Design a protein around this nucleic acid. Sequence first.
RNA 1: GUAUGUCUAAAGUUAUGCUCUUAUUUACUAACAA
Lengths: 211, 134, 342, 100, 69, 29, 67, 83
Amino acid sequence: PIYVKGGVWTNVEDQILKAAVQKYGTHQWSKVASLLQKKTARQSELRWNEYLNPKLNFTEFSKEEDAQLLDLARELPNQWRTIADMMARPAQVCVERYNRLLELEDEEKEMLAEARARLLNTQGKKATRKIRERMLEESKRIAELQKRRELKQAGINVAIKKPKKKYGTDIDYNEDIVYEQAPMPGIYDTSTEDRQIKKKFEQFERKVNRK
Amino acid sequence: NEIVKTTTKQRLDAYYDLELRNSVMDDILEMMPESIRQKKARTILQHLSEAWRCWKANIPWDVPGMPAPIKKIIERYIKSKADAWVSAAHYNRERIKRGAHVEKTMVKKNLGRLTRLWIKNEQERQRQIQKNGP
Amino acid sequence: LIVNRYEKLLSQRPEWHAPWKLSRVINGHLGWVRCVAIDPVDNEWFITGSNDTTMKVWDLATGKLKTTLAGHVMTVRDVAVSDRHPYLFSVSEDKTVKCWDLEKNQIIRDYYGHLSGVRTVSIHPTLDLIATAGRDSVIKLWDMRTRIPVITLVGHKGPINQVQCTPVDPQVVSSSTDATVRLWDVVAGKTMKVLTHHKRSVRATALHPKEFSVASACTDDIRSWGLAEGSLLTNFESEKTGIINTLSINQDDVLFAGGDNGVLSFYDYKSGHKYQSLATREMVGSLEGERSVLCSTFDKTGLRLITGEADKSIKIWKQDETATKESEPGLAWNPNLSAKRF
Amino acid sequence: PLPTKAEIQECTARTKSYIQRLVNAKLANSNNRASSRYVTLLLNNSHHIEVVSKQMDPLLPRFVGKKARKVVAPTENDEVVPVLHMDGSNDRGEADPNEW
Amino acid sequence: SHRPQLEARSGAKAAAYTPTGIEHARLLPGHTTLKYRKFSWRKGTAFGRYINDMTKSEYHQEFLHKHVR
Amino acid sequence: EVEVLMETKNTQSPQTPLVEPVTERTKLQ
Amino acid sequence: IEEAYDNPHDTLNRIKKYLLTQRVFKPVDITMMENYQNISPVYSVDPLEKITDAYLDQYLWYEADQR
Amino acid sequence: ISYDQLAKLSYEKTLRNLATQKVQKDTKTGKITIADDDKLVNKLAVSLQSESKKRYEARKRQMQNASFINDKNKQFNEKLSRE
RNA sequence: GUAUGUCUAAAGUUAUGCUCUUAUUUACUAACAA
């Protein structure tokens, strides 16, 4: 059922919100709200600001601090946000202290599963689609190989079709060297080495053929 | 295939900003004595970007682990950028008053900029009020 | 062999120059004054290119804003009045190299071609041909009359922060971020010789007037180079000073270097002797990183330095006419020797 | 020595001649006949021959060859060149990275 | 995904590229020739008798005051 | 700096109003 | 608003309680409506407090003009 | 430690790894045939492979040691935590 | 519904703890119906 948001902060929900904040940061409150099926953006942000943020404090005030507080009250009359700032505390808590001084789970688990799923899924659709295409492509390739290999076993040698070249100057790199930038001309002689490496190459090819 | 596009009203900002980050990056590399990698410049420029946003917010950009010289340099460059922005905004608003040809999108942009500018001004006044009494 | 050379150095004496003081300050622009260039025919007015894009022309004598010029879109990174013919070239990050005509105060000819936000223009002294180079890492050469690029001096492997056009065979000195400098067989389309004696961005170069040489800057070191052979001439004492933005040399062998620290350096061009440091001031409201001299040039006289600082200020500097070898000598020159270049 | 005036005249003459030729080439190349009016024999051995340029139909493309090819440049840095900085900083050079 | 600029399109390739032989608009010959140089009632009241910061300029604050209400 | 021999100038407007050229056209009479 | 119509007395009671107690409120989002001369700030109070503000306002005007 | 020192110090090390256990020029061609011991070059090849292999396995162990979401983030938080 | 992107369009290049059965949710998707 669709409805108007609000309610009360269940601890699991709070935890989820915290996680979101770690993920997306303190200025994308829409996304975090979306992550919570019950609670609004504004609600969420407020909660983070007021209760949930770890760079707040809820430790009791020293006698000096009490003095500072009540003195502020005396001097700044009920401008409690300002007062809070002065204290260096969140405002509601300060107010409460001042006042003191003067005198179901299936649903929750659903959003959890969804939440964890989201947070562990950090890529735009382009990415997902791309990896999908990659694995599909791989599958296609192996299937093709299986055909080719099958035919070889059968006795019909089929050369693998090239990639249908996208443009006139598209390169196949096995045809010939990519952009043979040769080594710097030889000061020390290199002839024997050239031979040996050539032999090694040819030998490798032979091995592959036999393999 | 030597297309190279000119600047125009439509792509002016993007070009500006790329030029800026190139300049900043260069300066930081000049400064940096280890001769660090491009990947270590990514951290730098990303840092810069965050700084810019912080300035936009009027939240002071005080990252602890930096070297002071870098912090200085970035502060400078965002001041330059900021200057460019604010003046541009001012020019736009006079332009809008005049009733000139101006992009619907551009006018919205100017509204946004001027709002942020206003908020920054305002909360600076609040700070002032705090810092030296009523 | 080091001891010999050191001994020789100590034997010689770098001459005394009069020191400098902040004569005039102009809070003219509403941005950084990244370009400054002064009319070499008359020594009357000098223009300065802001980040605003409005390059503003300034009389020296009065100091007043002679007139604004605003044909560009993005920061006018460099300008260059041609003494040879009455054409103020300029250039922005908008990739334009617009040629103004001062006989009309409008722009005349644009030079399209540049792939990326061009950093510097230099006009050829003995031709109607101008050189320009930017992030493209390419120093192009424009025939003015016909407004085509004639030739493109490819070579540099990184943006090309300065350029200087000379009259000789090495017609171009291309100073890049690539930690190099190049001299070019312009006719060939080839670097005749490539000096590389820099650790960092070679991002401030200047031709000496009556010497036929060119000083260049790095992050600290400031070589000075003799461009006949394509040879080094002199290392300098810039060992602790900042990243050099600009490097305008005086007529009287008084090589200037502008610090990203903010500190105005001052060298005897012949020797290298740092004969004055001067920590600049910022405008009252500025931040402490902003005091950074981003531009500089001397007049025809050589008795007025002009500096485009990032405090949106166009500071000007006189040599002290009350100065002597006893009243303000230099900074007691000493070649350091600590595994040094001298 | 600041370069000789006479030799400056030489260089100017050479380079000016070159750039004028280059610009001419650029101009007569282009399809706009408008810019044709701002334009400022051989032997292949001991054996001798006359070279000619046959005028072609001013409908058909002037330069059939050129077709805006993408071409990668080979660098041709056959001669090696040093990159040669003189310093050795240990105390300040190692204390700094902890700050930087 | 979509990424900042680092190593610019260097006009090395554009140099080695073949000419196009198109006729652009502005390369049409403009300004062919060059120039050259020569060479009682008032008692009863309660009260009877530059900065280089674009965000703190007098012009700026004033402007904001003007253009907000 | 209101005290020092450094002479500051917060200029704004042009003197020559974009008509008077920066260099003048030399010619016969 | 709807609920308030439904439960007037209760709503009133709630309002009274809030007035007696509540001195820290939900933060006020803002925007700028664009009159192309002068952009005008638009404060957007969080609905619950807004009702309180309304009622209080109306009461004040009725009392002020009455007095 | 600079790359100056770390080079010489690594140089010193591989000299301890050594401490464990003719020129003919055709000047017309410019070809400087240094005919040297083919057994020693093979001993370089095997040693150098072994050095690189030792290092390669060293990372593999350190990768298999263990507030994140994916492989990279875990390491990215480790890059933050080391400071 | 589209941009867009792949695919096909035929001729043989000469080598020797689990399985199970179901019913329910929720989510997403759907030019398929309402």
